[PDB]
Design a protein around this ligand. Structure first.
Ligand SMILES: Nc1ncnc2c1ncn2[C@@H]1O[C@H](COP(=O)(O)OP(=O)(O)O)[C@@H](O)[C@H]1O
Ligand SMILES: Nc1ncnc2c1ncn2[C@@H]1O[C@H](COP(=O)(O)OP(=O)(O)O)[C@@H](O)[C@H]1O
Ligand SMILES: Nc1ncnc2c1ncn2[C@@H]1O[C@H](COP(=O)(O)OP(=O)(O)O)[C@@H](O)[C@H]1O
Ligand SMILES: [Mg+2]
Ligand SMILES: [Mg+2]
Ligand SMILES: [Mg+2]
Lengths: 469, 36, 53, 480, 484, 120, 236
């Protein structure tokens, strides 16, 4: 007969449980309280002393009474793994939420696990072509790498990650996991329907993508753990099936935020800006699992919310150290109507390197970056005194930079409704050539608007002729 | 207030207005020192 | 003529530069106050955390 | 002394009562104190319970008795609430006696998941030319209304409510829209006056007002939007449509911060607690469009946020922008110049809005949103010939989109107006005569082309034949 | 027996509160019956606060804790060379036990006033911009500071790669053994870094100490200290070591974490009261020892990561005030692709020419103020004026000097390769060459000197100086090559 | 003031100079009671404190209490918590400017800066 | 130092590098001593702690103590409680500046911000005081012009304005000096300039006697003689 305790304290997500007998459940164990609806899952967080553990609930605690009976499951929250998760929708505790019955998987795995060791690392430098001009040119992504999309409220993180899914996930070959963490339930509804309509999910056939959700309607315990759940499914595809896996997460900040909602309840003295003191380690224990091993590859794209547009906020600040590439979206750029609202200076890649992209590519990027830099540097003068007060060499640079700014914008296919403009997918090679040519001066006679919201240079010429008419 | 626009405080606190004040000025001194 | 055209154009530009500067002053005044408020709160939070323990 | 169902007050302060006993109390259960003031069981600890008071501290003393209610914080719900004004707990405060409830719902109800939902596709017609044309709202959507103090936010919400009389009088149940208005932190007199205005326009009979005003205890203000959502949800859950206005969520956040600080939760960014986003996200998630299987009902939300000095970058504003399906941004500078509604076109968007705009309006307003954003940009730098024409249109269009308060228009009235402007037929008329144009053109159409307006109202879409017929009607009036 | 063992009262967040352990020493290692290790940091009347060197998933109330008798220590010795270890010296390369000469405490007093001697020997980075403008000496602490992805690790890594020249030799006094400390970095970043060192056959004289981002906060806190002890084995036995602390920003954050969780009341920005001490006691352990004490040295390259160029932030300002100057990497420069992105005007070496190879000091006489003479005239160009033809001479030169100081990664240069290049640039022998061809000019000029003037290079290499005879021999060889 | 309204059915004026000091004193009392300060050091109960005063100033069936209040604006920041909360209650402003009065105009009220919600 | 002062009757010199590290050290253990922190992470006892140390470093009837204390200013912020609380204890303050130092002027002394109790006609003589005061007026007026130069350029400067600029620029440079101990940094051997030299040399420049001598002559030299010598050396 199993180990049972009694609830002795409840505050929000935190439930203290006393165990009358000798044996206490390990930290990270799943406990269960029987409810008339089913069960409330609790994750053990701390041993408090005097036979009592502190736990974090995975659902709402209203209704709990002191004295309520609690069961130790003997292990951590676990989730189904393998191909039977494909095309399904799963919550934080591995249950199906798609009304299509049990997930008949051979195996379940705990959602907590050690990351691969130093020995098991496997490093590479393979470019992942996106079709997005600003990324492919100025800060390419890495296959088997970690990609973060930073942005304040409403600047384009979800539109961005959806375009990446659109551009990469079909022709990938390996499997994908999408994990909604603390985002919009409706967005999950949207994505499900969209994936069915592209065949990526196929209810009466083969599916390529697993969906895991714990959205912004959920209590913090669930938002704090649901990323581990989606991750565990990706890990299995990687290790046991040697697959190249894609892991998309919107939005990983919500894991850290969730952590901060329970932190005071857990007894922790707060760190800077009210965050948990375990900010960096908690994050490390998560991100370090999202990596490429000798058994297989995981390419990860993660939306990273930026509180109050402040990139030095502890949450996004600590997220930077985990990424091979970082696309930073700017409100100031979005208000100018540049989409994607990418900040060409401030987004980065380990791969912008002659040894990797070739000297030509590398040099075009440097010159584009130099031009944009020169233009930024002059914003003071421009705004106060006017364009008339620049040198002639500097007027030209500003002209050229304004065209480069516009040429970096791009119509996304998933944006066709917002834009009314057909999506464009520009090849890396064509992005390099097109920008090279623009730097060389070959299009100084073309007006600005012709560079705005098109694909390659042919579209610039095309639009220019249209504008001439 | 006096010198708040023109005078050079630390590098990494520079206006473009500080930068030009020192530019238009250094040139002026150069010309006068050349003549004398 | 070219002299009376240059004074007039400078009076035009100086009217603009002055007007633009005024707006800049307004944007930075607003920024100043947000930062002022934040610094007071942030400094106090440090104090509170030190007192609680 | 049954200590299972009952307790004694140990201490009271800072809106909080520490109580000994109540052994069988549920987390988040409503309790009743001697004086009759109510509270909520927040922390169940060993040997005491922490209770948040729904009233003044004066109303509770040490040593006094406390009783279980047996109920998680809940609220009466149902159609019987129509025409009534209640406090955050659902008590009538209008003097018209007891509420006739269909039942009770908890204040906190988890939002519907992915499956019970369907995408939004039905219009919420506001009657405001600027909104319906530029940022259309659909049933089930959340659309933030955001701007500084005195920029017209309440007025947008109030005109949308007054507009619903058009269908709420009809017999077509699917087109109806019941309205819940939540006054959080507002002046009691303001709310009393607002209710009179709704009564004057015969809008009160389809509206419910939940009020927790500036002098009421912070927890009541924190609670009002949730109990209100449960009230709105009755309509959603029973094959009907409701619109809820949270006026405003800035003040709800401030009230929640008060409690959080007094409970000694660590202050974070701008002193708000870590869960201040969850406060709003759990709330706004409950607005939704439900699938056929689920009755097809909806709850549409118009949360309101007051910015300080235009700071849309602040904590709470960014929290809510990252919850809702877009925003109507109201700008003080436009409001000052008499551009009202003061919509900043370039910053305002409705994510799931186009799919739920009336087609006729979609058709006649092509480019109107982009143009207006471009036009403003042009007017900012402003004698190039081309840029003198763009300036001519935009000035007329701007003027055309102005609208007096309390005067929402039917869609069949809006399309002829917008058609004219967008297709040059106003380029010739004097700026100061655009308002005179509107009312004369409508009078003309209502007596001379009534079958025109009728087809627009009934089909919601313009055929080539009907579009052409509208062109004829416009040119004909322009001449005279 | 409660003197030598104890019982867990409570455990969570990597902290264990323990009853007993009555005889425990402050900072002593303890063992938990499940296998995880910890460190006693709070000795209080009824209990001991222990920070865990691993997961607490396996620690439980009532569980036994055993004294080890030992203040936290680490293995040291030359047998650690070519190894990758964790913060406690445990191997993580999968190559079996560590060959240890002995064991040193993690915390060791810095050498006093007396046992030191003024820094006088070069640490040759192989980087034109560094070696010429901010030369670093054996025993010096030189900060590397800048936003993320500005080249900070690259600077330190090239320096490690450069030491191949002397390490392959047999002269022990010119050798520089390398300790790289990874603090709070991704494992894959560290793996990539040791792959590089292996590919340039540099691992054989390197030691990597790793406390990566997923590892318990006490390990990240401790790593720079145990690594110091590792580096000091060299310092104390008449040899010379270079230690890179990459980075101290993340160490400070780890220290904050464990200190908050030990419930120590925090100070500024919730960092511990003694966060400055954390870094000052570490960096003071870098030193040039006296002749009496064996002449050994430890040179430190701590890394600090700023945000949005804010060097005025708490921790950056703490470390700046500790080191003997700073190399200041700027994003604005790194984006143009002037790399390394060293801000010359702001990067300083408080040791100075005393640490520079004399031959290099000669050829780069004014170079630093010459890029203050050039930076001056950089403002003259957007001023719009087309005057000072005398200025044109310096105006052109600086732009060529800037292109000369650019340098690819993983490509460090010997002094005999640098000295000619600097001489060529400073004396205006470049003023007549096209900007876009300075790159190819370099690699050809050095082919030419290896092909023909092979004795010229050997001279600079062995003597480390330029006699009036050599100075003209080089001058003649320069003016010669200009004409293709 | 309330008594004149409730008992004698009057339309009373209530003057408060200065409303900020009421807020400031509330903040001091809050700090001294050991309550955790809120944004900018003000009391956590800022808005309810204000509401418990302001909501009493209103019209009933018997008469009315109308209030004219001197409003100090800390650091001239209208977005400061004190005025920002106070302003939520203001139905009108009377702005006296030194720009005016120097021109010899009395009462020295700026006819454009002074505003009323009742000019409707 | 106190023993030498009181019992040996001596005239003592006390050099302290760096006095900030005293307040900082107190800071580092304050929380563990159980104090609530004060502003900027400092101990509540900051001022009195500093008092109990500074008031001992004084001059009594038994003897004299002259102390030179280096005062670190964290992040260059002179409003930091530590340096701020130090000012009241000092008879004279030598305020360095990153702004000055980055222009190559060593010692990086701010000519305006540095103060002395003893800058007094009654103490240094009416001549000295007048020279100092007008050097300071020249340097202040210079700042105000640097503004006009930033926006409007040179064309709106009077002939006196342009002269003020020229002289101030020479004055700034003339305030630089090669230090003996800075020899390894400068290359230039260090100079020591007697006070009388200084006043005389600066008076001469304030009057106008060197308006024909270019800037570079005033930079990194000793007295007025070393100026003319450098001026002639650059002619050749
Ligand atoms: N690529 C884009 N093209 C056009 N508009 C965009 C684009 N990306 C974002 N937007 C605008 O920003 C709004 C918010 O985008 P979203 O991705 O939801 O932001 P976030 O996820 O960062 O909060 C979109 O509805 C759209 O109006
Ligand atoms: N369309 C309009 N035309 C004229 N006045 C308006 C209009 N809309 C609002 N107002 C007036 O503007 C003032 C502020 O509007 P309100 O709805 O209170 O804005 P807010 O809710 O942002 O504070 C009120 O006096 C209101 O009567
Ligand atoms: N000298 C250089 N030349 C060219 N590229 C460089 C150079 N130094 C660094 N990089 C590029 O910058 C990228 C990141 O630099 P890194 O040294 O890791 O900076 P940080 O340690 O400050 O984060 C490297 O992957 C490399 O591609
Ligand atoms: Mg999103
Ligand atoms: Mg309002
Ligand atoms: Mg690095």
């Amino acid at each position: 007969t199993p180990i049972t305790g009694k609830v002795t304290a409840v505050i929000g997500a935190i439930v203290d449980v006393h165990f009358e007998q000798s044996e206490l459940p390990a930290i990270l164990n799943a406990l269960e309280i029987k409810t008339p609806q089913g069960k409330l899952v609790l994750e053990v967080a701390q041993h408090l002393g005097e036979n009592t553990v502190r736990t974090i609930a995975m659902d709402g605690t209203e209704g709990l009474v002191r004295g309520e009976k609690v069961l130790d499951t003997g292990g951590p929250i676990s989730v189904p793994v393998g191909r039977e998760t494909l095309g399904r929708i799963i919550n934080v505790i591995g249950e199906p939420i798609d009304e299509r019955g049990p997930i008949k998987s051979k195996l379940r795995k705990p959602i907590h696990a050690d990351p691969p060791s130093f020995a098991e690392q496997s490093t590479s430098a393979e470019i992942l072509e996106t079709g997005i001009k600003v990324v492919d040119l100025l800060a390419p992504y890495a296959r088997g790498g970690k990609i973060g999309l930073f942005g304040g409220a409403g600047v384009g993180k979800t539109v961005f990650i959806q375009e990446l899914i659109n551009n990469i996930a079909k022709a990938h070959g390996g499997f994908s996991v999408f994990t909604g963490v603390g985002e919009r339930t409706r967005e999950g509804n949207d994505l499900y329907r969209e994936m069915k309509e592209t065949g990526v999910i196929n209810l009466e056939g083969e599916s390529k993508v697993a969906l895991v959700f714990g959205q912004m309607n959920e209590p913090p315990g669930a938002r704090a753990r649901v990323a581990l759940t989606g991750l565990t499914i990706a890990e299995y595809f990687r290790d046991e099936e040697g697959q190249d896996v894609l892991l998309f997460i919107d939005n990983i900040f919500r894991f850290t935020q969730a952590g901060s909602e329970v932190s005071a309840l857990l007894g922790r003295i707060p760190s800077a800006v009210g965050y948990q003191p375990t900010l960096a380690t908690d994050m490390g224990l998560l991100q370090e699992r999202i990596t490429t091993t000798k058994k297989g590859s995981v390419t990860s794209v993660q939306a990273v919310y930026v509180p109050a547009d402040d990139l030095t906020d502890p949450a996004p600040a600590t997220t930077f150290a985990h990424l091979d590439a970082t696309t930073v979206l700017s409100r100031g750029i979005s208000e100018l109507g540049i989409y994607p609202a990418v900040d060409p200076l401030d987004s980065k890649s380990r791969l912008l390197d002659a040894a990797v992209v070739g000297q030509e590519h590398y040099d075009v990027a440097s010159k584009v970056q130099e031009t944009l830099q020169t233009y930024k540097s002059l914003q003071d003068i421009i705004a106060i005194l006017g364009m008339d007060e620049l040198s002639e060499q500097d007027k030209l640079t500003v002209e050229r930079a304004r065209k480069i700014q516009r040429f970096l914008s791009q119509p996304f296919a998933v944006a066709e409704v917002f834009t009314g403009i057909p999506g464009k997918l520009v090849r890396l090679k064509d992005t390099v050539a097109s920008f090279k040519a623009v730097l060389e001066g070959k299009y100084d006679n073309i007006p600005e608007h012709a560079f705005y919201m098109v694909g390659g240079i042919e579209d610039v010429v095309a639009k220019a002729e249209k504008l001439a008419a | 207030s006096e010198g708040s626009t023109g005078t050079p405080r630390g590098s990494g606190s520079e206006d473009s207005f500080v930068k030009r004040a020192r530019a238009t000025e250094d040139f002026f001194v150069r010309q006068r020192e050349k003549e004398q | 003529q070219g002299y009376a055209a240059e004074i007039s154009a400078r009076r035009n530009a100086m009217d603009n530069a002055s007007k633009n500067a005024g707006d800049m002053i307004n944007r930075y005044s607003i920024l100043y106050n947000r930062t002022r408020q934040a610094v007071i709160t942030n400094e106090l939070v440090d104090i509170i955390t030190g007192a609680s323990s | 002394a049954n200590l299972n169902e009952t307790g004694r007050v140990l201490a009271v302060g800072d809106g909080i009562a520490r109580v000994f006993g109540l052994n069988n109390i549920q987390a988040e259960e409503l309790v009743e104190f001697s004086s009759g003031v109510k509270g909520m069981a927040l922390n169940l600890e060993p040997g005491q319970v922490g209770i948040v008071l729904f009233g003044s501290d004066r109303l509770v003393k040490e040593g006094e008795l406390v009783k279980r209610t047996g109920n998680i914080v809940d609220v009466p719900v149902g159609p019987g609430l129509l025409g009534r004004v209640v406090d955050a707990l659902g008590n009538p405060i209008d003097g018209k006696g007891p509420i006739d409830a269909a039942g009770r719902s908890r204040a906190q109800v988890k939002a519907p998941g992915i499956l019970p939902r369907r995408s939004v596709h039905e219009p919420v017609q506001t009657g405001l030319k600027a909104v319906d044309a530029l940022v259309p709202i659909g049933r089930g959507q959340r659309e933030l209304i955001i701007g500084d103090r005195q920029t017209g936010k309440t007025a947008v919400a109030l005109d949308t409510i007054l507009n619903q009389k058009r269908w709420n009088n009809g017999s077509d149940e699917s087109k109806k829209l019941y309205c819940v208005y939540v006054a959080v932190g507002q002046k009691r007199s303001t709310v009393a006056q607002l209710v009179q205005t709704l009564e004057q326009h015969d809008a009160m009979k389809y509206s419910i007002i939940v009020a927790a005003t500036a002098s009421e205890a912070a927890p009541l203000q924190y609670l009002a939007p949730f109990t209100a959502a449960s009230i709105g949800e009755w309509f959603r859950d029973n094959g009907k449509h409701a619109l809820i206005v949270y006026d405003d969520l800035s003040k709800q956040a401030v009230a929640y911060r008060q409690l959080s600080l007094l409970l000694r939760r660590p202050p974070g960014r701008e002193a708000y607690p870590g869960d201040v986003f969850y406060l709003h996200s759990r709330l706004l998630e409950r607005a939704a469009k439900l699938s056929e299987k689920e009755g097809s009902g909806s709850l549409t939300a118009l949360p309101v946020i007051e910015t300080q000095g235009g700071d849309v970058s602040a904590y709470i504003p960014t929290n809510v922008i990252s919850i809702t399906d877009g925003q109507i941004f109201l700008e003080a500078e436009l409001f000052y110049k008499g551009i009202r509604p003061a919509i900043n076109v370039g910053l305002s968007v409705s994510r799931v809005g186009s799919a739920a705009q009336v087609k006729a309006l979609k058709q006649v307003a092509g480019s109107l949103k982009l143009f207006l954003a471009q036009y403003r940009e042009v007017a900012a730098f402003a004698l190039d010939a081309s840029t003198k024409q763009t300036l001519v249109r935009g000035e007329r269009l701007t003027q055309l989109l102005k609208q007096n308060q309390y005067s929402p228009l039917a869609t069949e009235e809006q399309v002829p107006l917008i058609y004219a402007g967008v297709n040059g037929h106003l380029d010739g008329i004097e700026l100061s005569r655009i308002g005179e144009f509107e009312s004369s053109f409508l009078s003309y159409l209502k007596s001379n082309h009534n079958e025109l307006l009728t087809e627009i109202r009934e089909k919601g879409e313009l055929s080539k034949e009907l579009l052409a017929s509208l062109k004829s009607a416009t040119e004909s009036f322009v001449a005279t």
